[PDB]
Amino acid sequence: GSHSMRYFYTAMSRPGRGEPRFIAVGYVDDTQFVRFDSDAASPRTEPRAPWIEQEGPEYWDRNTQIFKTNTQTYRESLRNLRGYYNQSEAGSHIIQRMYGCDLGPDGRLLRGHDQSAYDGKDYIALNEDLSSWTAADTAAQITQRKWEAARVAEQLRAYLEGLCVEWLRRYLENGKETLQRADPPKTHVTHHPVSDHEATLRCWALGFYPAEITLTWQRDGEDQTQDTELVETRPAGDRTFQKWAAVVVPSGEEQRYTCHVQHEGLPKPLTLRWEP
């Protein structure tokens, strides 16, 4: 029932290889729905999910206007930050920005976000109050002063409490058949001997949405945190996600081990064991 929208901007300079690339992508939860890329042959905002396609040409043009303006603005910001850090014109640098709104299960604004980073390090973030900034260092303090002068926090607050929430709600309704459908994981446990003395139990979760899941192994009902190999949740490429967790167990203590699976799509949490 809990939903979010985010935009992710990446601006990357590349001295000697033309002007900085700007790319923006938009997500509702784990579903990407829009992209814009200053490097594309003809840069325009493009749909990346079926439910956004129904938006009319005035939506597409509005987005495209915004991201074109951002392309130019970020090129200036890259120049400025290079200066703030006394950096040479030789190196590539990246500004990243992620912002957006969280809704609770009732559809109300839980909180808003707007954070920027420079070469992968926190640089400036809007505080949870949506009215003040946290600047990481003396360079970011310069941006902070600029943004206070432009009344940025007040404008973001209005967006995050207003348009962000309204459009998220619209998208959730238009895409309700996928965005508000939780697909439970399909699960199974595999067993492969590693030697005479030990075997790997691997607990699989496939085909689930959204990406959030808990996979644990227990021995005698106690968590095996330090002994579980736990792979990053990965996209299947069809909107769904995959994950596995593995423990190496003594032969044949296999029945002492249980895999536990929590996910929104399940009627009830699962307890699985290896089934010879």
């Binding site: 915004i66 910001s77 600029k146 943004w147 404008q155 967006y159 962000c164």
Partner: peptide, 9 residues
């Protein structure tokens, strides 16, 4: 829909 104001850092 994205935020519409740009501001140089």
């Amino acid at each position: 829909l994205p935020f519409d104001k740009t501001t140089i850092m």
